Amino acid sequence: SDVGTVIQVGDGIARAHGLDNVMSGELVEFANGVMGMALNLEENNVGIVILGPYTGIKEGDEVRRTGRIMEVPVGEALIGRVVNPLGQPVDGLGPVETTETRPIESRAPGVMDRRSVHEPLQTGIKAIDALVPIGRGQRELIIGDRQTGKTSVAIDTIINQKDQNMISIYVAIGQKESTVRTVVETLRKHGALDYTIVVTASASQPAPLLFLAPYAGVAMGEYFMYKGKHVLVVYDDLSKQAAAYRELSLLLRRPPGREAYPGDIFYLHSRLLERAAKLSDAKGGGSLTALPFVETQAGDISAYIPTNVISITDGQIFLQSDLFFSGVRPAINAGLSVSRVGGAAQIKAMKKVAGTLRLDLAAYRELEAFAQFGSDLDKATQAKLARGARTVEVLKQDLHQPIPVEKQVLIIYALTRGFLDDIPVEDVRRFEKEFYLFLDQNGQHLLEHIRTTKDLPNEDDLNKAIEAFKKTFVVS
Amino acid sequence: MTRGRVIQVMGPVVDVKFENGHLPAIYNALKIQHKARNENEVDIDLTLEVALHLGDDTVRTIAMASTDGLIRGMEVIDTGAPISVPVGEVTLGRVFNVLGEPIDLEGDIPADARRDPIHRPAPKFEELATEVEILETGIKVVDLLAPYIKGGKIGLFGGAGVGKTVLIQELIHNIAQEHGGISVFAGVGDRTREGNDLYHEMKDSGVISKTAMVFGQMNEPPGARMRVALTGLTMAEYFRDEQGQDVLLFIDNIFRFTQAGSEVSALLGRMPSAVGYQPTLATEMGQLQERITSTAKGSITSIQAIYVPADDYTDPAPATTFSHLDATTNLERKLAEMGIYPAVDPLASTSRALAPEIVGEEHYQVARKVQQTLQRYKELQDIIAILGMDELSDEDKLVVHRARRIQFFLSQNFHVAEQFTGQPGSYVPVKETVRGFKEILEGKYDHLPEDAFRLVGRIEEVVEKAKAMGV
Amino acid sequence: TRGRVIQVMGPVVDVKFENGHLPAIYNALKIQHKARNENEVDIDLTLEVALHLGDDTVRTIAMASTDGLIRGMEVIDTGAPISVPVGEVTLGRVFNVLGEPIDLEGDIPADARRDPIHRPAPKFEELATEVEILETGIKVVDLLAPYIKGGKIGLFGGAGVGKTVLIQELIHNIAQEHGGISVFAGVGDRTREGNDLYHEMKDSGVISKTAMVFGQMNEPPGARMRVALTGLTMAEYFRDEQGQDVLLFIDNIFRFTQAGSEVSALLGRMPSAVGYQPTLATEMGQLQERITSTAKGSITSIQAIYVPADDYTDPAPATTFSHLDATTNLERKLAEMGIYPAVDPLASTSRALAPEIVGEEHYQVARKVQQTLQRYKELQDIIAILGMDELSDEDKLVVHRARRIQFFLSQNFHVAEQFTGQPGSYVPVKETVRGFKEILEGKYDHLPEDAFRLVGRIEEVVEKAKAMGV
Amino acid sequence: LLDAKASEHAARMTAMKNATDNANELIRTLTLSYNRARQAAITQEITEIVAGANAL
Numbered sequence A: 001s002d003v004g005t006v007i008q009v010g011d012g013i014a015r016a017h018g019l020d021n022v023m024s025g026e027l028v029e030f031a032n033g034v035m036g037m038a039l040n041l042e043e044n045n046v047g048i049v050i051l052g053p054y055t056g057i058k059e060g061d062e063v064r065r066t067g068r069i070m071e072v073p074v075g076e077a078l079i080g081r082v083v084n085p086l087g088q089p090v091d092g093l094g095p096v097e098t099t100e101t102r103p104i105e106s107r108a109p110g111v112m113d114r115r116s117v118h119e120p121l122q123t124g125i126k127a128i129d130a131l132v133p134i135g136r137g138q139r140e141l142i143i144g145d146r147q148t149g150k151t152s153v154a155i156d157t158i159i160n161q162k163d164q165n166m167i168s169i170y171v172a173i174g175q176k177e178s179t180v181r182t183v184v185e186t187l188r189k190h191g192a193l194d195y196t197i198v199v200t201a202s203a204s205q206p207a208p209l210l211f212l213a214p215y216a217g218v219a220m221g222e223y224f225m226y227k228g229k230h231v232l233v234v235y236d237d238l239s240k241q242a243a244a245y246r247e248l249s250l251l252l253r254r255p256p257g258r259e260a261y262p263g264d265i266f267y268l269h270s271r272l273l274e275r276a277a278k279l280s281d282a283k284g285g286g287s288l289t290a291l292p293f294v295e296t297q298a299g300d301i302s303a304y305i306p307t308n309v310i311s312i313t314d315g316q317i318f319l320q321s322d323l324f325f326s327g328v329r330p331a332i333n334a335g336l337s338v339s340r341v342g343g344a345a346q347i348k349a350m351k352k353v354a355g356t357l358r359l360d361l362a363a364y365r366e367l368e369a370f371a372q373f374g375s376d377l378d379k380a381t382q383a384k385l386a387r388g389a390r391t392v393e394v395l396k397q398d399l400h401q402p403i404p405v406e407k408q409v410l411i412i413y414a415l416t417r418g419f420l421d422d423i424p425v426e427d428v429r430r431f432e433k434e435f436y437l438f439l440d441q442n443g444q445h446l447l448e449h450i451r452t453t454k455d456l457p458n459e460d461d462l463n464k465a466i467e468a469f470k471k472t473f474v475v476s
Numbered sequence B: 001m002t003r004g005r006v007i008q009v010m011g012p013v014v015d016v017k018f019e020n021g022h023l024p025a026i027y028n029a030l031k032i033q034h035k036a037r038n039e040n041e042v043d044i045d046l047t048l049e050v051a052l053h054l055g056d057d058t059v060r061t062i063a064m065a066s067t068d069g070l071i072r073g074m075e076v077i078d079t080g081a082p083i084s085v086p087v088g089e090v091t092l093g094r095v096f097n098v099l100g101e102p103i104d105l106e107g108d109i110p111a112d113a114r115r116d117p118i119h120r121p122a123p124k125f126e127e128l129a130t131e132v133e134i135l136e137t138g139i140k141v142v143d144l145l146a147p148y149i150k151g152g153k154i155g156l157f158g159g160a161g162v163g164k165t166v167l168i169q170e171l172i173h174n175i176a177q178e179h180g181g182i183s184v185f186a187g188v189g190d191r192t193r194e195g196n197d198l199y200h201e202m203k204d205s206g207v208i209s210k211t212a213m214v215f216g217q218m219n220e221p222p223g224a225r226m227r228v229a230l231t232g233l234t235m236a237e238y239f240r241d242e243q244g245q246d247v248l249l250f251i252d253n254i255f256r257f258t259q260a261g262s263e264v265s266a267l268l269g270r271m272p273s274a275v276g277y278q279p280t281l282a283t284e285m286g287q288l289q290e291r292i293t294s295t296a297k298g299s300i301t302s303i304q305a306i307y308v309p310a311d312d313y314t315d316p317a318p319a320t321t322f323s324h325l326d327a328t329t330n331l332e333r334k335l336a337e338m339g340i341y342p343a344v345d346p347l348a349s350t351s352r353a354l355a356p357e358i359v360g361e362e363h364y365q366v367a368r369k370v371q372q373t374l375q376r377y378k379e380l381q382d383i384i385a386i387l388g389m390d391e392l393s394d395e396d397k398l399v400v401h402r403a404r405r406i407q408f409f410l411s412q413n414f415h416v417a418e419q420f421t422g423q424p425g426s427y428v429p430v431k432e433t434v435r436g437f438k439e440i441l442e443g444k445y446d447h448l449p450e451d452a453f454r455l456v457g458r459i460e461e462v463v464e465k466a467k468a469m470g471v
Numbered sequence C: 001t002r003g004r005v006i007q008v009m010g011p012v013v014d015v016k017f018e019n020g021h022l023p024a025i026y027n028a029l030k031i032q033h034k035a036r037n038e039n040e041v042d043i044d045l046t047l048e049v050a051l052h053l054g055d056d057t058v059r060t061i062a063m064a065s066t067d068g069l070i071r072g073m074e075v076i077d078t079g080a081p082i083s084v085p086v087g088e089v090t091l092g093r094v095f096n097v098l099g100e101p102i103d104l105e106g107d108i109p110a111d112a113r114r115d116p117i118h119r120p121a122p123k124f125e126e127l128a129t130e131v132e133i134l135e136t137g138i139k140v141v142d143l144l145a146p147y148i149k150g151g152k153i154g155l156f157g158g159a160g161v162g163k164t165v166l167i168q169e170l171i172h173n174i175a176q177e178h179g180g181i182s183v184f185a186g187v188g189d190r191t192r193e194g195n196d197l198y199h200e201m202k203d204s205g206v207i208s209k210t211a212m213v214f215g216q217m218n219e220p221p222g223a224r225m226r227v228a229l230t231g232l233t234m235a236e237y238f239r240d241e242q243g244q245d246v247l248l249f250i251d252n253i254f255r256f257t258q259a260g261s262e263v264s265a266l267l268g269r270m271p272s273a274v275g276y277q278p279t280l281a282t283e284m285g286q287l288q289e290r291i292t293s294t295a296k297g298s299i300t301s302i303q304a305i306y307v308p309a310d311d312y313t314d315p316a317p318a319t320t321f322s323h324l325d326a327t328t329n330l331e332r333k334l335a336e337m338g339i340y341p342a343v344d345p346l347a348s349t350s351r352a353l354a355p356e357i358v359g360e361e362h363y364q365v366a367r368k369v370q371q372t373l374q375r376y377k378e379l380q381d382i383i384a385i386l387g388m389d390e391l392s393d394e395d396k397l398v399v400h401r402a403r404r405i406q407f408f409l410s411q412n413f414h415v416a417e418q419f420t421g422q423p424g425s426y427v428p429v430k431e432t433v434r435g436f437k438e439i440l441e442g443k444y445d446h447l448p449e450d451a452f453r454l455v456g457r458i459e460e461v462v463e464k465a466k467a468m469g470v
Numbered sequence D: 001l002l003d004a005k006a007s008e009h010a011a012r013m014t015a016m017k018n019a020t021d022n023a024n025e026l027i028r029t030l031t032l033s034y035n036r037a038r039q040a041a042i043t044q045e046i047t048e049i050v051a052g053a054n055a056l
């Protein structure tokens, strides 16, 4: 039959006896009204994970089979609401009023169903858009130590997506609830919430919901994706999903591994991250996109969970604390951060203006290390060392201040083409702001051409505009 | 029935068989009261808390007092509820154990006074309130580099004997006099000498009338030490919600809550992970620390001391707790031995309030600029360790001179240090603290010697301390 | 004679065959169920046997998800190992682990020959071991670790350092010219790269001479384990029966070793070393000893290996190192400095750097470069603490030349067109020897060092300097 | 010049003695950290092996 009884209860994990027709991955309902998922099926005991408060479930309570595989609610009504991993409203404001459901154990789009990613995701941060580009459907990893600015680079991205017909999801895994309310109030102030969905799994919840939260978040976005509209997803910590599985598993009694992690860490992370894709024109040309996070103890790139996730994603953005304390913000180590799709995800102007930049900011980093040990140097090295410093300045940018792409290409054109050399280093950050003002009042034609064509205007005209401003600017 | 029997005893852990169909809930409390019926046997009073359902009508229970004397077959009564702690105005001025009983020898709490449970669910998203204003402690290093926040969590990390309790006593002295509100002091794993010492400090001050104290100490069985933090917080939660008063909650060592769980978790039959820690570390810590929050009704500010197990920060317990804290100061043993008191790491300590908006632009350019000078000094640590300062050139020489000035000018004279060094203490207001750093950074005090910059309050004090030397 | 499921333990399943006509190890089974009621889900599954337990019961590893599996279902015994289409029918088409065509191009007929995936390895009576040199056009490999035609070649590196990019440069060059079948397989392959490679083969026209097996990172471990053996049975049929010479490309063979671990605990095996299977060297041996060039015909084999945690002292890389003829090791420290391809010129060694198999002039120059770069390594410690000006004229001249040699090992690839703007270069071997000899003799030492990065021939370096103004 | 050159060589000699003494002290301090670590890793690998062996 379809009824059983709980025999062991502890630490959120339960075993039941009976329930003969259950499937792996089913939903099961206890008497208290708390729901559960079957993950193991021995000859005499079914192994069930509780998805709610377990302080009311006693031995000898009944448990009954729903008949459904694990399903997350989807629909247009979820947009602008704060929700649980299960489809349950949290912000107050009443029901979510969804229409249909999707499995959380979907198959990924296969080979022969995908296209090369061929369209930008303009974040509005100079270093990311110029050096480490992202295109719709390319997975990109933000990895850094605690308190280095990682959350900011994500929130700034959602805010600078208002014009495009984008839908964004923020999944908060393991975060203290006060912080999530702070993020939501921040989005509401910048007007971002109108096109976003927030999914919350606070540190007080049983680890099973922490484990389900990322899957629920992609399950919600793929609905839009197969319908054609483009989507972006952010996972606030995948390193807290890993910790949560380790408890869910060590508890289940599955033996340990490297550290105490199971071996199925790579499967878990692959299952989630491979549902991100750019579908082809036959499928209607949608896109999912993903931004997972990973925190590393002592700021180390070489470790078990960091290298597993660095193996799956289509690039990485590594943020360093020692750069952060030395005045470079947002601090991105250019030597350790590379993008696999870089070059296809840019407007034609940015490809031409800024192609050798990621390597360039790497030769300066090495030539700085050697010359701190070289005493006197020659002319070709004194010239080049200067460019890297001029570049590290131009790459700096404060919090909650977006720069449009047309302005990024023009300041990088001074930087790559080299008219910027005359200005002392200390005045470079200031020179930028005055240049943006001058460009808005006078140079509407050059920006018009960039918005119109996605290409660079005639060199003589650009040289004329920039040389003329170099008359107006005043310097030390 | 409600009566159940003991079946196994295993240090802290005990196993209780119940009648079919009448088992206790998963955090419910039980009673053993036994009178010796023969010379061989001994008499007992004990209470136990349910922790797992083991099958075969068996519930596994952690204990709240020593299980010596337990004879298999000792009978058990069922309270029907979690451990219930007396709450209301009657708590003020009193000293308590985990069971809720008064240990102060001033009487016993009237049986009709309302007692609420220890284990209650955490506060909802709709209720929580987020705001920022700055709390002023008069301690130089906190006020510039990592400022504390009203209504937040404040965490003090450090290894064995590195200065956690003295900084807590200086915070109590300045803040609880100025607070105008309720305080709770909760001691988990606190050296007993301190408990006799403080009770006397609070009575002599007259501050006792507005505060309540829970103690469970290094001598007590492991079970009692876990539940003591939860006990202190149910009293504090009544003061924030129903009285509506603002509250301070002080915890003496929060590390012992995880450590006590580590010992009992292994005997409960769970498997172990990482460096021997339990398989439920994140969830157990988070369940306690999410309750400690500011709300629309009122605010709690909590000051916590974290013992690092060895001088190892990467160890699983200290690092799981870092995420839940708003402002953090990390004391370092190597500085303590140089003579820098308090021994705060200037570059490792972080707080959400060093934002140009919250602390203001002036307090901001100055804070980051201090960090930039100090970080360069760490890079130059491993060169100057061998050759000395002949290898250094130009900017390297000027940077090391100013770093030496800064690192000694972050050290202070405390009123609580008077019991160790004969000097009087100093309180430095924030406007003075920010102003002082600027003149050191500009180079206006380049001439004065480094030994004049130690254990002083406001900047002027350095000029008179130099003039005493004449160097 | 049918069977019944008893335990479903994630990836593993346990089937008890009551007839007493149990199956065989390496055999494959079938689970085909149509849903009786609305609650159930339709299932189509294959499972490969692993172990005979006591109570008439057999442990099996699945080749699809065990979602929707209900205790008591029916298992049909094929009586054979997994069987794969082999013949000209494979040329130009892409298949899954079971030989079913993934591509939309069509469906293979049931009249076609199929061969079994499992087979004993070739024997000492009929292996062979002649040496020739395979030209690539990549400077580091063509000088310091020449690939041998008909031999095993291995690319080792830690995560995100260029393994996939270097495979795409070799396939552009070696694929078009070679006149024999070329099989490419993808154990644990990033999908966004499997799809890109199909369109790259279609652009050039290499597709008519190729066959592909894809197994993605998202499949159940069982599928990732057997996707190497499927590619190998196709390549074996072309070697033995047709007799044409062949290339095999296997992508991330570590994911084969990693899958075994996941299934080891649920099979009932006790753990060994750093959470690894008790049978690591065995399984690697069975797969690797099939990949040989016999008296009948030659398989040139190129493989990518992922160094599990940036630790070359780990069991999976160490055991693998014993089975190769040439190896290039990739280092993240070089990748941080921007020297691409990031190849260790000391740790990369091949059995063919012998005077007879490459010539006296080649060998002289190669070992002399390896002395210069080992001398630069020890001298960097002294420079880092004491400073460069402290040292002798011979020590200064070593650091001078070693900087130039290390940057001149970098090269502009065609697959670096997308990553670096500049189009790309192919350097013939004779040219590489001339140029490296000039650097060692000091002729080009006047030029500034920044001109040696991402370039192909030494002629180019002279012009690149002219633009700088030297 | 005879006083200047005599006093130089002497200066280099003094610095080099102190430099060598600082380096040799750092070698014993570093050596103990290495030994402490080698002992630590060995215990970790053994305990992870035996924890899985106890489970199975």
Ligand SMILES: Nc1ncnc2c1ncn2[C@@H]1O[C@H](COP(=O)(O)OP(=O)(O)OP(=O)(O)O)[C@@H](O)[C@H]1O
Residues within 6 Å of the ligand: A144, A145, A146, A147, A148, A149, A150, A151, A152, A329, A330, A397, A398, A399, B354, B355
């Ligand atoms: N460009 C910038 N200029 C100045 N300050 C900056 C800049 N970018 C970030 N910051 C500051 O750096 C800090 C970043 O805090 P935040 O919590 O966002 O970091 P995080 O590394 O994402 O945190 P977590 O470790 O919790 O993920 C804040 O003080 C923020 O204002």
Ligand SMILES: Nc1ncnc2c1ncn2[C@@H]1O[C@H](COP(=O)(O)OP(=O)(O)OP(=O)(O)O)[C@@H](O)[C@H]1O
Residues within 6 Å of the ligand: B158, B159, B160, B161, B162, B163, B164, B165, B166, B167, B307, B341, B342, B414, B417, B420, B421
């Ligand atoms: N500000 C200070 N002024 C004078 N002495 C100090 C100061 N800070 C630390 N010390 C000295 O160092 C020791 C610090 O003792 P303390 O009671 O603060 O240790 P603790 O870190 O709290 O101990 P524990 O780790 O066990 O909790 C004492 O000997 C004390 O005199």
Ligand SMILES: Nc1ncnc2c1ncn2[C@@H]1O[C@H](COP(=O)(O)OP(=O)(O)OP(=O)(O)O)[C@@H](O)[C@H]1O
Residues within 6 Å of the ligand: A310, A311, A312, A338, A339, A340, A341, C157, C158, C159, C160, C161, C162, C163, C164, C165, C166, C252, C306, C340, C341, C413, C416, C419, C420
């Ligand atoms: N020859 C090259 N020239 C320029 N950039 C290169 C070159 N080779 C690699 N890179 C850079 O390094 C990246 C390496 O990414 P890739 O996925 O190939 O790494 P991988 O080591 O193969 O990954 P995995 O180990 O997970 O399979 C490239 O996408 C590119 O950014």
Ligand SMILES: [Mg+2]
Residues within 6 Å of the ligand: A150, A151
């Ligand atoms: Mg964050």
Ligand SMILES: [Mg+2]
Residues within 6 Å of the ligand: B165, B190, B191, B194, B252, B253
């Ligand atoms: Mg103390």
Ligand SMILES: [Mg+2]
Residues within 6 Å of the ligand: C162, C163, C164, C165
């Ligand atoms: Mg790769």
